[model samples]
Target: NPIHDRTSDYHKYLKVKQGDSDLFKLTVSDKRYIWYNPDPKERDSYECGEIVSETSDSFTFKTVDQDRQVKKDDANQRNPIKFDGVEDMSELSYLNEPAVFHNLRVRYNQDLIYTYSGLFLVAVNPFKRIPIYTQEMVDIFKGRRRNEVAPHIFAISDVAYRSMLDDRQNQSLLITGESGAGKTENTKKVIQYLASVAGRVLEQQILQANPILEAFGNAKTTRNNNSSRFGKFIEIQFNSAGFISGASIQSYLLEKSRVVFQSETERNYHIFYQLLAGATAEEKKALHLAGPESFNYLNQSGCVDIKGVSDSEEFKITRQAMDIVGFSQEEQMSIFKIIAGILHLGNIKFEKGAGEGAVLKDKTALNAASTVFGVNPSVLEKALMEPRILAGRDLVAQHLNVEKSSSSRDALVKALYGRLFLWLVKKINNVLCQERKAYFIGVLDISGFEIFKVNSFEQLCINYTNEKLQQFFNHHMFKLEQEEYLKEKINWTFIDFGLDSQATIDLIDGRQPPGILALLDEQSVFPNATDNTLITKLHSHFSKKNAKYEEPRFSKTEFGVTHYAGQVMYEIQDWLEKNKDPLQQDLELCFKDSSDNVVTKLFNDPNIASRAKKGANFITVAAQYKEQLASLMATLETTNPHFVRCIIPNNKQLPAKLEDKVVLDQLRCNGVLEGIRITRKGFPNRIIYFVQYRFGITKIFFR
Candidate 1:
């Protein structure tokens, strides 16, 4: 089925034409607007570059600094700055004042802009300059301050409300963006907007559910001032009367890999960084930390010296969110204690061999691991010295020829750390959803696409996920749009293109697939078959990507790029390295085959490999690792399984209220699908779109 989902038609509605004049011309009236004040008296007027509010929708301009309030002096009182006439709405200088936007504004606002006049919400922008709200919008949203929000926010909010009104069973708002692009912060604002004007009509349960969700779902990341440390799906369930019923979270992708260990460059995210890291006096007092410098891991990190930000503040926010969601203090404290325990665990340091240690190169680490994980130091030491623990009914190796016991310890520490974080999430889920019966709003704060020499497992999953999401959006806007247009019964001159489904299937499952699972399956059988063998086999079996471009080469393992489709290359090496054989293999056989262990043993005794096949210890150790993996996986599935995504920005442009064709064209070429632009002074900027669609709408101009 043919579809037109890419949004080319919608772009034409902005009155933007390539290489053209008549851009930003307010002279012509556009009836497509809902709350426009066309009166000459109410038009924005610029004077000495400052914005002096003339009426609700217009302003007299002044300098960016002049708009800022100055403190009074004792000897002389300066008069307030005045604004005289001569305005130009065409220029974007009026929107760049941060002081005016953040401080002068009493509170934050949202906006909504339209692409065409018909009631369909073709596009939405957060920082837009649209000024009018329909009665239906005001009534349903119960908003007043929204007058200050951009028009697009209003439009989206209105559309969401309307969508729910018609089909109360389903209404969702997915706000996604790269780090520092304000996804989490923006999401919080969206929920806030929805709640505040719920007209004092929201159920107490709904109000209470807020804190719990925030406490459990949100966190701080280096890139984001506030990162959603998890992926959330909030279903604001409503009863028959349109009032909020009990809310519930479908689930969240709480990051689990970061639990155990972090690389030198990456300090296991902010939670660990904060706990072991010290806090300043002001911060300590606020967050109730007692200046715990001993636990401060980032003290030497250049990042520690910055001010005004607080982990404690985050904690308080989290706690408050818990309270809002009706999480009892006991449940909250239990979660905090878990965090504290994990911090204590990180503090443990290791030392090498003591007493009867045959694993001489690393005795110190065993002591540290034991103390940190809270096992008996001696028992922990013996477990390492010996080779294996018990596996089911049989005694495994304390030092079997199988996977090294030390590595198993390392993996366990990792699993524990990961599980602890999951436990914290599960803990929150129990209090907020299972117990409180509150619906949840999950905010996903994850990383985006990345490529490095050894693009590990995480990078593969995240990048693959992004590819699918982007593809889904592309298909929906481009492919599905045309399909809907062809359907005669629906006089729908618009679209909510459903091509996203295909995009989803492509990365998940397809016969000749590009799906994640498919790639993993292909890589798994790769060891027996060289790269060339596998590529050739795949090429022969299916008319897929790489057949025509180049002859496949030999690869010991599929860890890097595979020349596929003549036009593009499949960088599968990283995927292979990342999704390295099962966690079971790592636990069972990997350590025994380590280059370091092999070399060290070779140096100790050149004929070690030839000498060792018959030890009872070897069988025991291997079995222990195999059993451990099973238990760990079981724990993960039941208690906490998490997801993470990395985000990347496709475009960057300060918001403008009036539309500009040059910028719109550039945004489309880049990968920006749609976005909300807000003025620095906190008004609606413009509702920018990325498409070639040109549907006739009042203000939209196109060639």
Candidate 2:
């Protein structure tokens, strides 16, 4: 790699220090080239062309197959051949799309996953373990400044740990990327480095928390064998003396519906299979458990086993982690009991034999669930098939038909597993965040922004969360630098980069014009409000927002929002039900009376209990998500934040298969290009996206 030792010293990238600003050489030298976009509408779709001739300003160039003439200002200038293989992109003479992409590809082709852009680090998933993360590597970065070391994640974390102690500002380290990029595993490396360098404690508990979480939150998707279905915002607390004191885990956005349904070749939460595999033969009998193939939840997706995974062994390891993270035997057993209870609940079948009303044909599954849950079987049956629902005057028992009964039962299954997982989070949080602390370093592990073909409320929340997190990056990276420049009385003009995301942020979470969230909260409260009415109101409010929002011209059931990553059209189906996420009163009433302590806690907790009141206006999923996120942003502002943006190399989870388009799309979406721009603010000036290359201390890419 061409070296400046791979550091974030942008001044060294200045015109006077290197890459002379000789005008004549830039003007059609013997072999100068330009990256010409065949379509201005496309960002990275480019071809490198030799600069055939140059006149006053407009120039002509020809690629091997095609010829074109364009204004010099409109061309994406290519870097000189000597700048190839530069370790830090900020060191490049030309910072255009292909230049940046090629630099990353050059190093990636050499198996160098960590590259630098000023102080920021970009990691491409090699999908294979490397030898760099060791005690020796940690020791190498022990007391050195970031600019003093070769690019590594430990170097980034070391800066935060040292910067936290020196600035006395609590820090927030965010590991963000789409799934399969190794964002999940890389989070630990940061923690490992921080835990070691500034002195560490609660060490085992901190590290051991994942297996326990993985058991509850991770599951098999088509792409990944062990994918996380939930996000955990971990606050690793510390004392004034820089000692690791305690931890807190705020688990949110669980894939609740996955409990009841699995797409083909997929599975439900890992714990279900784990409990079925590793339970003692005797304990299996006690819990009325059988193989996964015997359970509806697991068997629906014929593919049950991951090629290399042993669920029983995973169960063993998860149990070992539970023991280390301070789970009591009772807590451990009760936790598995919840898992076992859900399997039995899934197997329960209903029949509408004589009338439209539903009745249980086999009490086998019901008895098993009630036994593990310590509730009366007949009462559980009534709660499932005939439940008391609130009316205008009084509460009444309402009977459900077979299909509806199955759905209600599925709802209970969903809540049983979903809430229990959250309960475990709270329980884990008790151990993680119990001790008093001086300051804390928070590690946020959330999946990155996603814009699927048929987006929904769930995707809305995820994209919304990502948009907010991105603005936080903008605030710290873009806002802070301009303020410092102004304070120094330098000849500087403020960059409005920090406000780049606010309108869209306002479009999603804004209050003044009643954002998508507010629209959702309003519609979620009225019984008459259906998904249709939601689109109506969304259009009434946002249809005119051509750039930021759109009412799909051909479809009435969906609306689209141009998110930070890309345009996402959301299907309004289940918009209300998903928002309300209704909890059956009879279901709660039955569980609230249970003698099982862990089971009782779920129904009796003030948050769960209070929300169960008979009203359409009870908090929706969107409201709580927005509230918690607002709280997270508020909490984030209290600390000095450091960002880690992971880039997925390719869709195939194999090593050495870096797809250029895949990598480029992520760079644009991840807001890392903005990150690259922000970190290189020492530049002379910046430009709007899509405007071709201009030389500066900071180079702007088409984001």
Best-performing candidate as measured by TM-score: 2
Candidate 1, residues 215-311, lDDT tens digits: the string is 4444333443344445444544444555444344433334444444333333344544444343455433333333334443333233432244565
lDDT of 2 by residue, 1-703 (tens): 1123334232222111234557435644568888877676876677788888888987788875777788877767888856655657887877667788877776777677778875567888888877777776787778778767667788888788777888788888877777677778778888777777765437777778889989888888765667778877788778888888877888787988888888788788888888888899877988899899999989998877877789999999999999988889988888888888888999999999688899888899999999999899999899988898768879899888998889888888778777788787877777767679888888888855655456678778887777777777776677766675565444568766534677778888878878988988888876699899989998999887645998888899988888766788899998888888876888988898888888888878975445633263666788778778878888888887777778888777788887867888877766565666665655333453334223323334221
Instruction: Give the Å shift of residue 252 in candidate 1.
Output: 4.5
**CA RMSD (A), model 1:** 16.9
Local error of candidate 2 at 237, Å? 1.8
RMSD value for candidate 2: 6.8
Task: Kindly report which residue stretches of model 2 are placed more than 4 angstroms away from their true locations once superposed.
Answer: 1-33, 36-71, 222-224, 483-489, 496-499, 607-616, 681-703
The per-candidate count of clashes, in order, stands at 95, 4
Score every model by TM-score: 0.52, 0.87
Give residue 240's lDDT in candidate 1 (0 to 100): 57
